[PDB]
Structure formats: C-alpha cells, structure tokens
Amino acid sequence: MGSSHHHHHHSSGLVPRGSHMMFKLTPAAAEQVLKAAKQGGTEGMCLRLAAGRNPDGSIDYRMGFDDLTEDDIRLTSEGVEIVIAPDYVSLLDQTTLDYVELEPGQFHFIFLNPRDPTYRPPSGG
C-alpha cells in the first residue's frame, strides 16, 4: 500500500504514465507519417527511428516504418506508434520531432535534440 490510492491497482496510461521515452511527435508531423501510412504498405507498420551518429560529430537521424516489435521500446503518439530499440534509445531520447520545410517545398523531419546541437553558439558568447 502507498500514499497514492487508485481503484485501478495498475494504471494503463492516460495520466499516471505515458511513453517509455521522451519523444515529442508533433501533431503536424503526425499527419505526414499518417499520410505515408495512407499511401499503402506501411499501413499496419510501426514507425521506427534509426540513429546514425558520426564518430564525435553529429547524430544523423533517419525515419522509416518497420515491424512492430514488442521487445522494442514501444511508444504511442497522437495517432502513430513508435518503436525505438533499447540500443537506439541511447541517442534518441529528448527527441523533439517537428514538421518544418528547411528547404522550399521539401518537408524535412526535423529532430530537435538538445543532445546533438543543430544550432550551437560559441562558449562565452
């Protein structure tokens, strides 16, 4: 027994718990992922992230649909399910996924990670 008294002895989610990781999949990006799953093939597939970190430099992030692995770290966004393996999570936490076009007309999946500085001012400036 504890201080927090709930009728549900094990909450499934909603408020007490959420995702296994801090992964912000923006509702804007959600439509892009949903749109891809609307095209076909990737319909009943889970969204997976690939971390390709350059040896002491920058982590290059890739996104694609893969197989729903339960031994993989499952996340649930607004309307998309994410799988980030316990190996990739090592570099894929604190990932803020936004939906902006860095290039004209070219909508880029932009991973705003404070871990890998996309914009970093000098020290003491």
From TrEMBL:
It comes from the Bacteria. Gene3D superfamilies: HesB-like domain. Residues 23-101 form the Core domain. It holds the Pfam family Fe-S_biosyn. This is DsrR. The lineage of its organism: Bacteria, Pseudomonadati, Pseudomonadota, Gammaproteobacteria, Chromatiales.
